[PDB]
Ligand SMILES: NCC(=O)NCC(=O)NCC(=O)O
C-alpha cells in the first residue's frame with residue numbers, strides 16, 4: 190500500500206528531525222507492506238522571511254491534491270505580533286480540517302514513579318482560540334478587555350466521537366493481547382461546569398451524546414472530571430486515565446502538564462487529526478540553540494509518525510516503531526544531549542533502525 | 548492585640564479542624580501578645596439542606612477583623628437556590644486575592660518546593676456571563692465572556708510584590724530558604740489572548756512601579772502551559788507566581804499536588820481590610836466525625852492570615868511549632884501515615 194506524505198520541516202531542528210523520520214519511513218521492514226512517496230513543502234518562519242508569507246497557498250494546494258498525510262517539523266514562532274505573519278501551523282490545521290489535537294503520553298516499561306498510558310484528545314478549533322477580543326474601555330489606568338469563549342454542539346460532538354473511536358481502538362489492541370495498565374476502557378470528559386455552566390454544560394452534554402452515535406461505543410466507560418483536580422490527579426495518579434477529552438484551553442494546558450511525566454520534550458509526540466487527513470508533529474519547538482549541530486532528538490518525530498500510521502490503519506508498522514524506539518531508550522547507550530548523552534541525531538536513527546530489523 | 552474572628556466551619560471535617568484551630572488561637576503564648584474573640588457563623592451544604600445566610604455576612608462586616616472558613620461539601624450538579632457560599636463570601640468581603648503557599652517540609656519525601664500562587668479571584672471567565680447564542684437542535688452554540696481589567700490586574704500584581712517583599716524580609720531575619728533572591732513570575736497565554744492577557748501582563752509589570760521597595764524584586768513572565776510542565780519537574784525555580792483567575796486555579800491545584808497530603812496545604816482569601824483563612828482540603832465526608840482529620844492545613848491558614856494581619860512573629864512560631872511536630876514524626880494523623888487523632892496533634896503543637 191502507498192502513502193503520499195507531505196514533508197514540512199519548517200525551521201531549526203525541524204530540518205534535522207524530518208529527514209531522520211523520512212529515513213525511518215523509507216526503511217521499514219518488508220513485512221509492513223508499506224511504501225511512501227514524499228513531497229517537500231515550504232512553510233514556517235524562514236518561508237516568511239524569504240517570501241512574506243509563512244504559509245504559501247501552493248503548500249496547502251499540494252497537501253489537498255497530492256497527499257494522504259503530512260509530517261510537520263517545528264515553526265520558529267515570534268514572541269510578538271509581526272505584520273504579515275500568522276502561524277502556519279494554526280493555519281494548516283484549520284485549512285486541512287484537523288479539528289482534533291491528539292497527545293499520547295506513555296511511560297517506558299521500567300520507568301521510575303507512576304506509569305502512564307493516556308491520550309489527551311483536545312478539541313482544537315474553538316473555545317477562546319476564536320481570538321475574538323475587544324478593549325471595551327480605554328480609560329488610562331482603567332482599561333477593560335473582553336474575550337469570547339465559544340463552544341459549539343457540532344464541534345464538541347465531533348471531538349467526543351473521536352475520543353470514543355480512540356478508546357475503542359486502544360481496547361482492541363488490549364484485546365489482541367498487547368499488555369496495558371488498563372483493564373477497562375475509559376473516556377474522561379474534562380470540564381469546569383460549576384463556573385461555566387452554559388459553555389461547559391454544552392461541551393459535557395455533547396461528549397456524552399457522542400457515545401450514542403455508534404453501538405460499539407456502548408461498552409466504553411465514561412466519567413467526568415473537573416479540570417483543576419485533573420491536574421492534581423495527573424501528577425499523583427496518572428495511571429487512572431485512559432482517554433481524556435477536553436475543550437481547547439483545558440486540553441492545551443493538560444497536554445503540556447502530562448508531557449512532563451515522561452522526561453525530555455524530545456520524546457513527546459502529537460498528531461492533528463481530521464476526517465480525511467492527519468498531520469504528525471513533534472511537541473518540541475525549533476530549538477535554535479542547537480539547530481544545525483546534528484544533536485536534535487528525533488524520537489518525538491518517530492513516535493509522531495507511528496501515531497499517524499495508527500490513524501491511517503497501519504497498526505503493525507506503528508507498533509514496531511514504538512518497540513524499536515523504546516528498546517533504544519531503555520538500553521540507554523545511544524542518547525542525545527537532551528537525554529544526558531553525547532550522541533547525535535543520526536546515531537539514534539541508526540539505533541532505531543537496527544532494532545526494527547532485529 | 549485582640550482579633551475578632553468569625554468561625555465558619557461549614558461541612559464535614561470543617562466541623563473538626565475549625566475547633567482545633569480555635570484551641571490553638573486560644574493558647575497563643577504570652578510573648579505574641581495576641582488574644583481572640585470568636586463568633587460562630589453558619590454556612591455550607593448542611594446550611595442549605597440557603598448556603599450563605601445574610602446574618603453571616605452582616606456579622607463579618609460589623610464585628611470581625613478576620614474569619615476562618617472550614618470546607619463546603621460541594622454538590623456534583625446544580626441545585627435550585629444553591630450557589631457556592633465560599634464564592635459569595637469572597638465577593639461580599641472584597642477578597643480579591645486567592646493566596647496558596649506550597650512549601651515542602653525540610654526532610655520530607657517529595658520534591659523541594661517553596662512558592663506561593665497569587666490568583667486574581669474576581670474576574671476572567673468567573674464573571675459568569677454566558678449565553679446560548681444559537682439554539683437550533685443539534686447545532687447549539689454557547690458563548691462566555693472572559694473579562695480582564697487593568698484595575699483588578701494591577702491590584703493582584705501589587706499584592707504579589709507585597710508577598711515577594713514580605714518573604715524576602717523573612718529570609719533576611721534568618722529563616723533558611725531555597726531561594727537566594729525574590730522573584731515574581733507573571734503567568735499568561737498572550738500568544739492566544741493577545742488583548743486580555745496582554746493587559747494582565749502590562750498591569751502586573753506596572754504594579755512594580757507602585758512602591759519603590761519593589762524595584763529590587765526580579766520579574767519574569769511565563770506561559771501557563773510551560774509553568775504547569777515546570778511545576779512537575781523543577782518547582783524549586785519559583786518564588787511568587789501571579790496569575791489571572793483560571794490559570795491561577797489550575798496552577799494552585801498543580802502546585803498542591805507536590806505535597807504528600809492535602810491536609811498540610813493552607814490558603815487565604817485576602818482583601819484590603821479583611822482576610823479569611825481557609826484550608827485547601829475538602830470536607831472529607833468519608834473520615835468526618837471519626838476524630839482523625841488533619842488540622843495542620845487549618846493551623847497554617849491561620850498562620851498565613853496572621854502574616855497578612857502583621858503578626859509575623861505569631862505566624863513564625865506556629866509554623867515552627869507545626870514544623871517541629873511534623874519533623875519529630877511521633878504524633879501524626881493517618882493521612883501522614885500515623886495513628887494520632889486531631890486533638891492529639893493539636894496537643895502536640897500546643898506543647899511547642
Ligand atoms: N512542532 C512544534 C511547534 O512548531 N511549535 C511552535 C508553535 O507555534 N506551535 C503552535 C502551537 O502551539 O499550537
Ligand SMILES: NCC(=O)NCC(=O)NCC(=O)O
Nearest residue numbers: 617618619621826827828829
Ligand atoms: N476549603 C476547600 C473547599 O471548601 N473545597 C470545596 C469547594 O468547592 N470550595 C470552593 C472553593 O474553594 O473555591
